[PDB]
Swiss-Prot record:
Sequence similarity: Belongs to the JHDM3 histone demethylase family.
Domain JmjC: residue ranges: 136-302
In-chain residues carrying the UniProt-annotated modification PolyADP-ribosyl glutamic acid: E16, E17
E.C. numbers: 1.14.11.66
Natural source organism: Homo sapiens (Human)
Name assigned to this protein: Lysine-specific demethylase 4D
Gene name tied to this protein: KDM4D
Amino acid sequence: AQNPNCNIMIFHPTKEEFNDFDKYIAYMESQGAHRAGLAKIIPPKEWKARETYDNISEILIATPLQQVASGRAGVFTQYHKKKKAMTVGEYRHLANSKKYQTPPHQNFEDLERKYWKNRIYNSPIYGADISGSLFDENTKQWNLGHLGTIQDLLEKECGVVIEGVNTPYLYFGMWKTTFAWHTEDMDLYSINYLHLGEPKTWYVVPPEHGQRLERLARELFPGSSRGCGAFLRHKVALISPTVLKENGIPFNRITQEAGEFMVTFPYGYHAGFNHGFNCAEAINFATPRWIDYGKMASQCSCGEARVTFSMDAFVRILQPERYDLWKRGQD
Ligand SMILES: O=C(O)CNC(=O)C(=O)O
Ligand SMILES: [Mg+2]
Ligand code: NI
Ligand SMILES: [Zn+2]
């Protein structure tokens, strides 16, 4: 069995290997990359996402989100308070302001220590989940707006034609902006490209050990767990690496820098934070190996999770027994 310790693997494809996206995902899995839940892919030196980032300031962040924490430094939830619209140029200036800027630090490890010590005492503002793309239309390799769609994959594997669409999302971050512990919708893969700016630190639990994280979360968030049998679908809970280690939960960590891709694998729980002003692009995708994870994905039916239109068909076809309850939680 390849990668039996479930280490995060880093790949350096050549320009020739960068042509066929599906083939390269299958290659990484042949080497055991999925066992970690997360892999890094460093593009060949010949590749670029677009020519420059000099002309992005007029993108609108319609609903910036202030991420307010509750709890203790290593075990907390966050809620998202909506703020007034602002442009990317306005948001960048805000991120660089004395109130929000990255503090002085020695290295990524010192910054990680400061994040976990101090995150709860501040409320950073995140431009998340903005439909759009920063890949040039002429970028033919690993262009996250030109991937094969999940509806086409389901149709190819299972023969059923379904409605829905699959488009990318932009994320504008600042110091301490935080992504809570989650797997993807329907336990899909994700791919994330860090277009510019400061790094993103990731934490990940191997898919084969995801239920260990779920059991700890039920212990640590006991009211939330009574409210919903899949409350991590709400994407609000944080647990630090120190708490994970104290409770014996297997995990790994890695820092993504600008110009790098990350892939999350089906049922790979992940969480993390941004180091300073940055912009990432991400999208969900599927492969044939995903189908069995999709069929077994947990679902929130309490009303909190609310998701896109396009997830309807996935539940309806893959999980018909669960469909009626889940759809009620969507309405
Ligand atoms: O970058 C973020 O805030 C969160 N991204 C992801 O969870 C992802 O790409 O799967
Ligand atoms: Mg612009
Ligand atoms: Ni994710
Ligand atoms: Zn729920």
